[PDB]
């Protein structure tokens, strides 16, 4: 099966998922000097006041916090989007060292980690239908740099001990994702793909310019998770990021001059 090691990592994925060599793959490097300011772009509208988290899970390649998406509770609109996108989960990618871990890069700079908030377009009725459409998903990408702790992240960090290995889950209610957002909502956007198999080209990426900062101790706890299941030989969950893919015939647009 696919993963991030030497014999099953990103350079091998195309053998099972040929779209890995597709025209609109993610992540990409954001070259700040060639991104185009688009004054037509709207401000983002994040409405997470009524979010309902359910549980946190180690899925064997990352950990994800899941939300109830049975109704318009937590949604994203505005920006480059048409319509209402419902939050279904967030997860992280991170490195073995503080100098790597993000998927997107900015002028080739790598951050310690990257947070992805995944939302799906409710006009397609369910998530499974949404992922088959070119405008089906919108993923909000937030960079993490190492500095001062983020209080809003600590609830997550403290429960990692109970989902150490693949397939473990825990109740995780009343988590407010607003605590993970930077002060500014300025962004870059481009049409892209999932960055893990099946690598479907169904994502509008929205990557925030402003990173959030987390402490060394917080990201340290991420690195103690395991890719393996319980009872199996220990493999630490680190460097679960895909390298930058060719931009090809795409333009990155910026919301800010
Ligand atoms: N890193 S990323 O592009 O946000 C994603 N990588 N895996 C993801 N999982 S997921 O949205 O739950 C998913 C699960 C099954 C099919 C399509 C998407 S999102
Ligand atoms: Zn991701």
UniProtKB/Swiss-Prot annotation:
The record marks 4, 59, 64 as: Fine-tunes the proton-transfer properties of H-64. Activated by X-ray, histamine, L-adrenaline, L- and D-phenylalanine, L- and D-histidine, L-His-OMe and beta-Ala-His (carnosine). Its EC number is 4.2.1.1, 4.2.1.69. The record marks 89 as: Involved in the binding of some activators, including histamine and L-histidine. Changing residue 15 to E: In Jogjakarta. Catalyzes the reversible hydration of carbon dioxide. Can also hydrate cyanamide to urea. Stimulates the chloride-bicarbonate exchange activity of SLC26A6. Essential for bone resorption and osteoclast differentiation. Involved in the regulation of fluid secretion into the anterior chamber of the eye. Contributes to intracellular pH regulation in the duodenal upper villous epithelium during proton-coupled peptide absorption. This is Carbonic anhydrase 2.
């Amino acid at each position: 099966h696919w993963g991030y090691g030497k014999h099953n990592g990103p350079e091998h994925w195309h053998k099972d998922f040929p779209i890995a060599k597709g025209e609109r793959q993610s992540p990409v490097d954001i070259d700040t000097h060639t991104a185009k300011y688009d004054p037509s772009l709207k401000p983002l509208s994040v409405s997470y006041d009524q979010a309902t988290s359910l549980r946190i899970l180690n899925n064997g390649h990352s950990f994800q916090v899941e939300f109830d998406d049975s109704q318009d509770k937590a949604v994203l609109k505005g920006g480059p989007l048409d319509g209402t996108y419902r939050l279904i989960q967030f997860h992280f990618h991170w490195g073995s060292l503080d100098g790597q871990g993000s998927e997107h890069t900015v002028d080739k700079k790598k951050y310690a980690a990257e947070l992805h908030l995944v939302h799906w377009n409710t006009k397609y009725g369910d998530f499974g239908k949404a992922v088959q459409q070119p405008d089906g998903l919108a993923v909000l990408g937030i960079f993490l740099k190492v500095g001062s702790a983020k209080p809003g992240l600590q609830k997550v960090v403290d429960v990692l001990d109970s989902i150490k290995t693949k397939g473990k889950s825990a109740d995780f209610t009343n988590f407010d994702p607003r605590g993970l957002l930077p002060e500014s909502l300025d962004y870059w956007t481009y049409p892209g793909s999932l960055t893990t198999p099946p690598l479907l080209e169904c994502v509008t990426w929205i990557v925030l310019k402003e990173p959030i900062s987390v402490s060394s101790e917080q990201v340290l706890k991420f690195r103690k998770l395991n890719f393996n299941g319980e009872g199996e030989p220990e493999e630490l969950m680190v460097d679960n990021w895909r390298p930058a893919q060719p931009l090809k015939n795409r333009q990155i647009k910026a919301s800010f001059k």
